[PDB]
Amino acid sequence: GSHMTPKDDEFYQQWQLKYPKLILREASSVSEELHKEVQEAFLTLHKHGCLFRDLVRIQGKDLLTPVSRILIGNPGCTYKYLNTRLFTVPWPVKGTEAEIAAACETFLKLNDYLQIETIQALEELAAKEKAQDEVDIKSRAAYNVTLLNFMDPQKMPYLKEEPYFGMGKMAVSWHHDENLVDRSAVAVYSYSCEGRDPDIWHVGFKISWDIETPGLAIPLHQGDCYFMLDDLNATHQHCVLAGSQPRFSSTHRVAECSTGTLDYILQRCQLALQNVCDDVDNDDVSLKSFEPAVLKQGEEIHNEVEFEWLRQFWFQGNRYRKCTDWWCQPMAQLEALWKKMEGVTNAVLHEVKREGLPVEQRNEILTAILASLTARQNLRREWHARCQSRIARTLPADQKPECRPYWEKDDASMPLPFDLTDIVSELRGQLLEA
Ligand SMILES: Cc1ccc(Cl)c(Nc2ccccc2C(=O)O)c1Cl
Ligand SMILES: O=C(O)CNC(=O)C(=O)O
Ligand SMILES: [Mn+2]
């Protein structure tokens, strides 16, 4: 098991014959106007301390990313990898701080450019496949976010070795980019500060399943861009090989956000609250229907807003409040919507305890809502635990994994306990009463 770089004669023909959906556009191809603007944006962003290592989960384990990052993109958009939902600090799409919003404006135009370069290469790539479709192409380049990366190999000197082709130290281990639109492209701007050369940053590629076809290590210099086209991200894996100097990168993606925008999730909540009499906002929640399919939907949306949104957000300690206040209000509103749903749940629970309610209808209600209440107990445990791992305590005071929402047994404001174990036990019991 070995690797190839431009030092090798076979490199170029291997690139052409076994990795042709990968494109390099060296630093020369990018206007010098742009290079300075985005390199300042990286630096300003870093200075204001907008880049955090993410507390991520993989194969059951809580791990911090070697790399520090921030997600920038369309307002209300999220990008989710390794069970962690990153929320965009927004960029001036038509429709917070002066210095910070300058960097975001910058990466938006980077986005515009990379998108342009991408559509072109996709057009060329299709043209080489002759020896409507233009909507497919344009959508697969419609980058809606970029995830920025930073590492200092010296200040962060805790790097794994590459296991298969001897490529050396990895800033990022072998992976596929998750949560991307099918066959959508990825475009990376690489900003270094200064066998394969250990001091230089590379991106590495291999075929999935394969450690016999030699991998490519491609040198990345200050300002070089690369592009993963079409199904490349699915058929191959990539990693980042660290150099010795620090480096930034901006990875532009077409996030599959069909259940991952603010608007999507507000609409979901609003769909749940249609089962609620909504003349007035108080604690006396009254439901229009107890048809199983509707109660189930309500409880599923309840879970969705709680775990994919509130807890994901608060798990990162409102670290983005340093960059924008953008999510602050929407997250308050989702909490407020969530609390009403606790009201809904409580009311369903009330109706299940009602005398003059035929067991048949009661058991139909139980069977509809049981899986959701179960999933809700287990995930509440998981998030509680994940919030209090010693790896999470070690973190600073502005990134402290807050377990929100959380309330004590004596809390008069909440109609239901955080711990649903007794509630769940009982409902399960009644369903087995024969
Ligand atoms: C699959 C994937 C996706 C994104 C990152 Cl940053 C990584 N890198 C890590 C993430 C968490 C913990 C360790 C690593 C690593 O690179 O060793 C990986 Cl392995
Ligand atoms: O930084 C790079 O060049 C490659 N980035 C990634 O693979 C990533 O952030 O998912
Ligand atoms: Mn990647």
Residue numbers in the entry: 28 to 122, 128 to 163, 188 to 250, 264 to 503
Give the published text.
FTO belongs to the family of Fe2+ and 2-oxoglutarate (2OG) dependent AlkB dioxygenases and contributes to non-syndromic human obesity. An m6A demethylase, FTO, was shown to regulate cellular levels of endogenous m6A residues, which strongly suggested that the m6A modification in mRNA is reversible and might be subject to dynamic regulation. Besides the internal m6A substrates in mRNA, FTO also oxidatively demethylates N3-methylthymine (dm3T) in single-stranded (ss) DNA and N3-methyluridine (m3U) in ssRNA in vitro, but has relatively lower activities compared to other AlkB family enzymes that catalyze a wide range of oxidative reactions. We performed a high-throughput fluorescence polarization (FP) assay to compare the differences in the displacement of m6A-containing ssDNA binding to FTO and ALKBH5, respectively, in the presence of compounds. This screening led directly to the discovery of meclofenamic acid (MA) that specifically inhibits FTO over ALKBH5.
In order to investigate the molecular recognition at atomic resolution, the structure of FTO in complex with the inhibitor MA was determined by crystallography in the presence of metal ion and N-Oxalylglycine (NOG), a chemical mimic of cofactor 2OG. MA was bound in the NTD region, and close to the interface of NTD and CTD. The binding site of MA is partially overlaid by dm3T- and rhein-binding sites. This explains the competitive property of MA binding to FTO over the m6A-containing nucleic acid. The metal ion is ligated by His231, Asp233 and His307, and bidentate NOG exists in an octahedral geometry. The following side chains come into contact with NOG: Asn205, Tyr295 and Arg316 through hydrogen bonding or salt bridge interactions. Hydrogen bonding occurs between the carboxyl group in MA and amides in Ser229 directly and Lys216 through a water molecule, respectively. One chlorine atom in MA directly contacts the complex guanidinium group in Arg96. In addition, the phenyl ring bearing carboxyl acid substituent forms hydrophobic interactions with the side chains of neighboring residues, Ile85, Leu90 and Pro93. Of note, the first loop in the FTO nucleotide recognition lid (NRL), β3i and β4i, which has been defined as the part of the NRL, provides hydrophobic interactions with inhibitor MA.
